[PDB]
Amino acid sequence: YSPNTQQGRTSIVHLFEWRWVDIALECERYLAPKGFGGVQVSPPNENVAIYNPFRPWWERYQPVSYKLCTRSGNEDEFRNMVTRCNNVGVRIYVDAVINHMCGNAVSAGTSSTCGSYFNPGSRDFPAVPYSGWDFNDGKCKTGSGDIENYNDATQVRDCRLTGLLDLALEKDYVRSKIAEYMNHLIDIGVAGFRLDASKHMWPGDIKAILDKLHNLNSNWFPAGSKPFIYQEVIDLGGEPIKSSDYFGNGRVTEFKYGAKLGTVIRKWNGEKMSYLKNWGEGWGFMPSDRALVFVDNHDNQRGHGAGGASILTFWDARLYKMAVGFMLAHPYGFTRVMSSYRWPRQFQNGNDVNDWVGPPNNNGVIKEVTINPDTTCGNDWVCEHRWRQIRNMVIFRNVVDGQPFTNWYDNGSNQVAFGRGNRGFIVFNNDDWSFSLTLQTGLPAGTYCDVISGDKINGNCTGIKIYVSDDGKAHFSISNSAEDPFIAIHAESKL
Numbered sequence: 001y002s003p004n005t006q007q008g009r010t011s012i013v014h015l016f017e018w019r020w021v022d023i024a025l026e027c028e029r030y031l032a033p034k035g036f037g038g039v040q041v042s043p044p045n046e047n048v049a050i051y052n053p054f055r056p057w058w059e060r061y062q063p064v065s066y067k068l069c070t071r072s073g074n075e076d077e078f079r080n081m082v083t084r085c086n087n088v089g090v091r092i093y094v095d096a097v098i099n100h101m102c103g104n105a106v107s108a109g110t111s112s113t114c115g116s117y118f119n120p121g122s123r124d125f126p127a128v129p130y131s132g133w134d135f136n137d138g139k140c141k142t143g144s145g146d147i148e149n150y151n152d153a154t155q156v157r158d159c160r161l162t163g164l165l166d167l168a169l170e171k172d173y174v175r176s177k178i179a180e181y182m183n184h185l186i187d188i189g190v191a192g193f194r195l196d197a198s199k200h201m202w203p204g205d206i207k208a209i210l211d212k213l214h215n216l217n218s219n220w221f222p223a224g225s226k227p228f229i230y231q232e233v234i235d236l237g238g239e240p241i242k243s244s245d246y247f248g249n250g251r252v253t254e255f256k257y258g259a260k261l262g263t264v265i266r267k268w269n270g271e272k273m274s275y276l277k278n279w280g281e282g283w284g285f286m287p288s289d290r291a292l293v294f295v296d297n298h299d300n301q302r303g304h305g306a307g308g309a310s311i312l313t314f315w316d317a318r319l320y321k322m323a324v325g326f327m328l329a330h331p332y333g334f335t336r337v338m339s340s341y342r343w344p345r346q347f348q349n350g351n352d353v354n355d356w357v358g359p360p361n362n363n364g365v366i367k368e369v370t371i372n373p374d375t376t377c378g379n380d381w382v383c384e385h386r387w388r389q390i391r392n393m394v395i396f397r398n399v400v401d402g403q404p405f406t407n408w409y410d411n412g413s414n415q416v417a418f419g420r421g422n423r424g425f426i427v428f429n430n431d432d433w434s435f436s437l438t439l440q441t442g443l444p445a446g447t448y449c450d451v452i453s454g455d456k457i458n459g460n461c462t463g464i465k466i467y468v469s470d471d472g473k474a475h476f477s478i479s480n481s482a483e484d485p486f487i488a489i490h491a492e493s494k495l
């Protein structure tokens with residue numbers, strides 16, 4: 001249940017589709033000094049090479065083998081990355097796709113990221129190796145063989161998720177091949193895993209696999225360190241399968257978090273920020289100590305999975321920064337920041353027809369991540385984790401770690417604020433008028449640099465300055481026309 005990050009580092013960043021060499025560099029040049037706890041990487045195992053459409057991001061969720069050979073790099077490059085990141089105290093978490101192999105309709109051949117032969121039709125994946133009796137063909141009871149109804153908890157687990165060949169996870173052989181793959185990664189140095197499509201695996205089968213896993217590599221981690229496990233389970237209610245069914249294996253993705261934060265910030269259906277006072281379990285969310293939270297993820301930022309049209313992404317930059325800011329300031333759950341790539345989003349009848357587009361590439365070869373002088377990224381990588389407003393809130397969370405939620409204020413509409421013990425305070429204005437008021441901050445008297453509009457550099461603030469007096473009060477002014485309609489100050493931004 002614990003992330004295994006360095007003490008004081010409270011967030012992980014999803015460097016979606018990034019190449020291993022770029023992540024290794026990012027660890028040393030940015031993530032380490034900026035205090036990021038770790039990185040969730042795209043599936044490192046060999047996958048189906050899909051040409052129609054042209055190399056979609058989702059081809060990486062169709063395993064061909066467990067060889068660490070993908071568009072992100074080979075095994076040596078993967079190990080190089082894990083080693084370099086761990087050496088600078090930044091962890092690596094692997095997106096483990098262990099529920100299935102490729103789509104059952106993919107043509108047999110060597111159209112895979114490493115040239116491995118596979119025959120979906122004959123259930124043949126010799127590179128593992130898996131064969132017909134390693135899949136759930138006979139176990140599934142639907143007429144299509146695919147998952148047809150989420151109200152039947154059994155077919156959700158035993159049938160094919162959108163045609164993906166479903167592994168017979170009850171077999172010790174299959175459990176062992178998966179464990180062999182994950183233990184290879186653990187021994188290499190990975191700190192944990194995102195268990196892809198966990199809702200599609202029986203809680204008990206996952207547990208059986210986890211019981212085969214090693215403790216983290218003792219060269220970097222304390223003896224007895226268990227790998228961090230966060231299971232992807234989309235539970236927004238209305239279905240028999242609940243997130244809680246997986247608490248015995250590790251943390252679980254709380255999709256209700258970003259879904260509701262999106263509706264609140266967009267002010268849909270009369271919702272407003274003042275309602276966030278009891279944010280957390282009060283909103284029907286899972287226990288904070290089991291939640292892996294985020295505003296958006298690789299799926300719902302592009303209409304895949306769940307979360308709805310309410311989901312906030314980098315496309316909605318201004319509101320997005322505020323959502324990410326609220327999340328990073330609030331004590332609930334363990335935070336994951338999304339880092340994406342720009343794609344030619346094209347809406348037709350309310351839907352993005354280019355939601356399949358893969359990462360920036362030159363004839364299929366993923367482009368490297370170029371760093372600009374202003375610290376942003378080129379080659380179409382959005383690099384949200386590098387936006388000042390997000391990067392400074394990542395440090396905010398670290399600074400206020402362990403402090404209680406306190407000193408909440410709200411105007412009954414969309415102007416709210418709250419503090420984290422005597423270490424940080426944040427103010428939001430999502431109303432269509434100015435927020436100008438003196439608030440109790442719970443902070444020691446002094447001059448504080450607002451870390452949203454600026455930075456504390458060389459003993460001075462580059463943006464807004466807040467003055468806290470002896471009573472802990474300070475005046476805040478946020479126009480609804482402000483570039484970023486929120487201010488955040490903390491112990492380390494104090495002059």
Ligand SMILES: OC[C@H]1O[C@H](O[C@H]2[C@H](O)[C@@H](O)[C@@H](O[C@H]3[C@H](O)[C@@H](O)[C@@H](O)O[C@@H]3CO)O[C@@H]2CO)[C@H](O)[C@@H](O)[C@@H]1O
Binds near residue numbers: 130131173
């Ligand atoms: O030996 C030739 C044979 O090799 C490969 O077969 C593998 C199976 O695909 C794989 O399932 C596994 O078989 C085990 C069963 O799963 C398990 O229930 C129990 O019966 O033990 C079996 C043996 O360990 O391993 C075999 C052997 O590696 C390949 O996939 C076949 O195509 C090939 O004919």
Ligand SMILES: OC[C@H]1O[C@H](O[C@H]2[C@H](O)[C@@H](O)[C@@H](O[C@H]3[C@H](O)[C@@H](O)[C@H](O)O[C@@H]3CO)O[C@@H]2CO)[C@H](O)[C@@H](O)[C@@H]1O
Binds near residue numbers: 317318374386387
């Ligand atoms: O630390 C680097 C810079 O980080 C910040 O720049 C961000 C913006 O804050 C973010 O909104 C986004 O730009 C959008 C912009 O706000 C919006 O008005 C425009 O129309 O669309 C943009 C979407 O791409 O991205 C940049 C980073 O690329 C910070 O504001 C800046 O001062 C820092 O230098």
Ligand SMILES: *[C@@H]1O[C@H](CO)[C@@H](O)[C@H](O)[C@H]1NC(C)=O
Binds near residue numbers: 458459460
């Ligand atoms: C802040 O800026 C002032 C004005 O230039 C400068 O005199 C001062 O030295 C700076 N603060 C620090 C701590 O360097």
Ligand SMILES: *C(=O)[C@@H]1CCC(=O)N1
Binds near residue numbers: 226229230
């Ligand atoms: C938590 O993520 C990991 C898996 C469960 C445990 O005890 N540690």
Ligand SMILES: [Ca+2]
Binds near residue numbers: 157166167200201
């Ligand atoms: Ca399954």
Ligand SMILES: [Cl-]
Binds near residue numbers: 194232
């Ligand atoms: Cl996820």
